UniProtKB/TrEMBL annotation:
<comment type="function">
    <text>Troponin is the central regulatory protein of striated muscle contraction. Tn consists of three components: Tn-I which is the inhibitor of actomyosin ATPase, Tn-T which contains the binding site for tropomyosin and Tn-C. The binding of calcium to Tn-C abolishes the inhibitory action of Tn on actin filaments.</text>
</comment>
<dbReference type="GO" id="GO:0005509">
    <property type="term" value="F:calcium ion binding"/>
</dbReference>
<dbReference type="GO" id="GO:0016460">
    <property type="term" value="C:myosin II complex"/>
</dbReference>
<dbReference type="GO" id="GO:1990584">
    <property type="term" value="C:cardiac Troponin complex"/>
</dbReference>
<protein>
    <recommendedName>
        <fullName>Troponin C, slow skeletal and cardiac muscles</fullName>
    </recommendedName>
</protein>
<keyword id="KW-0677">Repeat</keyword>
<feature type="domain" description="EF-hand">
    <location>
        <begin position="52"/>
        <end position="87"/>
    </location>
</feature>
<dbReference type="GO" id="GO:0008092">
    <property type="term" value="F:cytoskeletal protein binding"/>
</dbReference>
<keyword id="KW-0007">Acetylation</keyword>
<keyword id="KW-0479">Metal-binding</keyword>
<keyword id="KW-0106">Calcium</keyword>
<dbReference type="GO" id="GO:0036379">
    <property type="term" value="C:myofilament"/>
</dbReference>
<keyword id="KW-0514">Muscle protein</keyword>
<comment type="similarity">
    <text>Belongs to the troponin C family.</text>
</comment>
Amino acid sequence: MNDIYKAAVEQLTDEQKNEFKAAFDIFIQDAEDGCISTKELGKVMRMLGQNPTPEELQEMIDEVDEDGSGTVDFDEFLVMMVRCMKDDS
Ligand SMILES: [Ca+2]
């Protein structure tokens, strides 16, 4: 069980989700299922307001990838912020 998503969702603002939704929809303009690419995560961060590394972002991807299919949905896109709570150390 995880209670960080509830404690983190309350921290995030509507503006953050607004940007996240737009940052997602832009890529999901003609998606097959309705998600982005795990490798494209480094691209959305640059547009949102972040500049990580290929090894750093990689850990974030697999971490937020609840299904582990290959594409990043909105559920996996939003968790990126709340997942910070779970350090796993
Ligand atoms: Ca996925």
